[PDB]
Scaffold this active site. Structure first.
Site, PDB file in Angstrom:
ATOM      1  N   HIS A 153       0.802  -1.238   0.000  1.00 46.51           N
ATOM      2  CA  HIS A 153       0.000   0.000   0.000  1.00 46.51           C
ATOM      3  C   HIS A 153       0.832   1.284   0.000  1.00 46.51           C
ATOM      4  O   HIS A 153       0.355   2.328  -0.452  1.00 46.51           O
ATOM      5  CB  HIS A 153      -1.044   0.007   1.130  1.00 46.51           C
ATOM      6  CG  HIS A 153      -0.576   0.598   2.427  1.00 46.51           C
ATOM      7  ND1 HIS A 153      -0.288  -0.171   3.537  1.00 46.51           N
ATOM      8  CD2 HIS A 153      -0.415   1.889   2.814  1.00 46.51           C
ATOM      9  CE1 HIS A 153       0.065   0.616   4.538  1.00 46.51           C
ATOM     10  NE2 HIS A 153      -0.019   1.872   4.130  1.00 46.51           N
ATOM     11  N   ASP A 172      -0.685  -7.315   2.007  1.00 45.00           N
ATOM     12  CA  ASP A 172      -0.046  -6.006   2.053  1.00 45.00           C
ATOM     13  C   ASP A 172       1.486  -6.154   2.219  1.00 45.00           C
ATOM     14  O   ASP A 172       2.009  -5.952   3.314  1.00 45.00           O
ATOM     15  CB  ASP A 172      -0.647  -5.145   3.171  1.00 45.00           C
ATOM     16  CG  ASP A 172      -0.278  -3.669   3.037  1.00 45.00           C
ATOM     17  OD1 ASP A 172       0.283  -3.292   1.994  1.00 45.00           O
ATOM     18  OD2 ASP A 172      -0.540  -2.874   3.969  1.00 45.00           O
ATOM     19  N   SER A 211       3.612   2.810   8.413  1.00 44.59           N
ATOM     20  CA  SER A 211       3.263   1.743   7.481  1.00 44.59           C
ATOM     21  C   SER A 211       4.468   1.268   6.679  1.00 44.59           C
ATOM     22  O   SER A 211       5.288   2.088   6.247  1.00 44.59           O
ATOM     23  CB  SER A 211       2.204   2.245   6.491  1.00 44.59           C
ATOM     24  OG  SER A 211       0.951   2.300   7.139  1.00 44.59           O
TER      25      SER A 211
HETATM   26  C1  LIG Z   1      -8.732   1.188   8.765  1.00 41.31           C
HETATM   27  C2  LIG Z   1      -7.625   1.523   7.751  1.00 41.31           C
HETATM   28  C3  LIG Z   1      -8.185   1.356   6.334  1.00 41.31           C
HETATM   29  O1  LIG Z   1      -8.772   2.296   5.804  1.00 41.31           O
HETATM   30  N1  LIG Z   1      -8.026   0.155   5.696  1.00 41.31           N
HETATM   31  C4  LIG Z   1      -7.958   0.127   4.229  1.00 41.31           C
HETATM   32  C5  LIG Z   1      -8.934  -0.920   3.675  1.00 41.31           C
HETATM   33  O2  LIG Z   1      -8.608  -2.189   4.247  1.00 41.31           O
HETATM   34  C6  LIG Z   1      -8.821  -2.232   5.658  1.00 41.31           C
HETATM   35  C7  LIG Z   1      -7.926  -1.176   6.326  1.00 41.31           C
HETATM   36  N2  LIG Z   1      -7.037   2.843   8.069  1.00 41.31           N
HETATM   37  C8  LIG Z   1      -7.806   4.076   8.274  1.00 41.31           C
HETATM   38  C9  LIG Z   1      -6.876   4.983   9.095  1.00 41.31           C
HETATM   39  C10 LIG Z   1      -5.516   4.265   9.104  1.00 41.31           C
HETATM   40  N3  LIG Z   1      -4.430   5.164   8.721  1.00 41.31           N
HETATM   41  S1  LIG Z   1      -3.097   5.465   9.604  1.00 41.31           S
HETATM   42  O3  LIG Z   1      -3.445   6.353  10.668  1.00 41.31           O
HETATM   43  O4  LIG Z   1      -2.187   5.887   8.587  1.00 41.31           O
HETATM   44  C11 LIG Z   1      -2.491   4.032  10.382  1.00 41.31           C
HETATM   45  C12 LIG Z   1      -1.721   2.984   9.867  1.00 41.31           C
HETATM   46  C13 LIG Z   1      -1.546   2.129  10.992  1.00 41.31           C
HETATM   47  C14 LIG Z   1      -0.881   0.916  11.175  1.00 41.31           C
HETATM   48  C15 LIG Z   1      -0.886   0.285  12.443  1.00 41.31           C
HETATM   49 CL1  LIG Z   1      -0.075  -1.250  12.632  1.00 41.31          CL
HETATM   50  C16 LIG Z   1      -1.517   0.862  13.573  1.00 41.31           C
HETATM   51  C17 LIG Z   1      -2.194   2.086  13.410  1.00 41.31           C
HETATM   52  C18 LIG Z   1      -2.205   2.713  12.140  1.00 41.31           C
HETATM   53  N4  LIG Z   1      -2.771   3.898  11.701  1.00 41.31           N
HETATM   54  C19 LIG Z   1      -5.711   3.020   8.241  1.00 41.31           C
HETATM   55  O5  LIG Z   1      -4.816   2.296   7.800  1.00 41.31           O
END
Ligand SMILES: C[C@@H](C(=O)N1CCOCC1)N1CC[C@H](NS(=O)(=O)c2cc3cc(Cl)ccc3[nH]2)C1=O
Lengths: 229, 52
Positions: free
Chosen positions: A42, A84, A181
């Site tokens: 990603h 991923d 990430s």
């Molecule tokens: C829930 C997920 C999301 O949208 N997904 C994509 C579609 O597949 C399910 C996950 N999401 C929304 C906010 C979040 N973004 S973030 O704040 O950059 C992030 C990455 C990440 C990794 C980890 Cl390990 C903990 C917390 C966290 N927060 C994220 O990855």
């Protein structure tokens, strides 16, 4: 990384940082060998062109490697973040030194029975230190408890595949966050650190009732081996 | 707890059970020591070691 501690001299030498045209970090990676970096599939959509930085713990006080080949898992899905994972082959080899060394890839069954069963692993990165904030200028790390598979699926609003695992705290406010990430999740066994996960996603950062979701490296060891050949 | 289940079979790294006996092995860049249990780095900067 929200909470956690700064990586001190030599503590997270396998950390890699993917940097955009403007040389700003946007994702992490793990050093696997002189030519290969492990990262999240990603992350490859967050910049059109990128390079990899290694060895810097402080982005404000000063090696940059260009990428030759991007090997992305053909099954990565933007919709679930399943599969991923990506491997980067660099144009020039990494010189190992203080703060620059690879993490070990473990053998699959032993990883599953001995590493994934440990109490905790360690996540690191230059990501945000609060859900709303700027990228960290300092490399941080955080010990994160392995989370029971059932407890994890019960806590999640999205599907947890067998290519993923959960780690973190339910209530304590410490987690990976945006910008982390693609970075390392490593597990220590007798003073040797083995790559066990790739930082993948989370519903916010450090939210009560939510854990960090990581790519399960054991599910992809043969894939990684094949990519490095 | 027996064999690999008992303190990782006394292996530094990888433990496998072959014919009801412990067989230790190591990651790339380490050699298995003469005792068949310890893993010895072949160079500086072996994988998985903090550079302290
Ligand atoms: C829930 C997920 C999301 O949208 N997904 C994509 C579609 O597949 C399910 C996950 N999401 C929304 C906010 C979040 N973004 S973030 O704040 O950059 C992030 C990455 C990440 C990794 C980890 Cl390990 C903990 C917390 C966290 N927060 C994220 O990855």
């Amino acid at each position: 990384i929200v909470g956690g501690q700064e990586c001190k001299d030599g503590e997270c030498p396998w950390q890699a940082l993917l940097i955009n045209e403007e040389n700003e970090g946007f994702c992490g990676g793990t050093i696997l060998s002189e030519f290969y970096i492990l990262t999240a599939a990603h992350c490859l959509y967050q910049a059109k062109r990128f390079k990899v930085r290694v060895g810097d713990r402080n982005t404000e006080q000063e090696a940059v490697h260009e990428v030759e080949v991007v090997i992305k898992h053909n099954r990565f899905t933007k919709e679930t973040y399943d599969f991923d994972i990506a491997v980067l082959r660099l144009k020039t080899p990494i010189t190992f030194r203080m703060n620059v060394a690879p993490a070990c890839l473990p053998e699959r069954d032993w990883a599953e029975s001995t590493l994934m069963t440990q109490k905790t692993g360690i996540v690191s990165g230059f990501g945000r230190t609060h859900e709303k904030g700027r990228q960290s200028t300092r490399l941080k790390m955080l010990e994160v408890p392995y989370v029971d598979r059932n407890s994890c699926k019960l806590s999640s609003s999205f599907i947890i595949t067998q290519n993923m695992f959960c780690a973190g705290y339910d209530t304590k406010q410490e987690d990976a966050c945006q910008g982390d990430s693609g970075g390392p999740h490593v597990t220590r066994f007798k003073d040797t650190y083995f790559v066990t996960g790739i930082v993948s996603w989370g519903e916010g950062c450090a939210r009560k009732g939510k854990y960090g979701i990581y790519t399960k490296v054991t599910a992809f060891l043969k894939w990684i081996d094949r990519s490095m050949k | 707890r027996k064999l690999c289940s008992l303190d990782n079979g006394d292996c530094d790294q990888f433990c496998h059970e072959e014919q009801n006996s412990v067989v230790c092995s190591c990651a790339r860049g380490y050699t298995l020591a003469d005792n068949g249990k310890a893993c010895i780095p072949t160079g500086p900067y072996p994988c998985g070691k903090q550079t302290l």
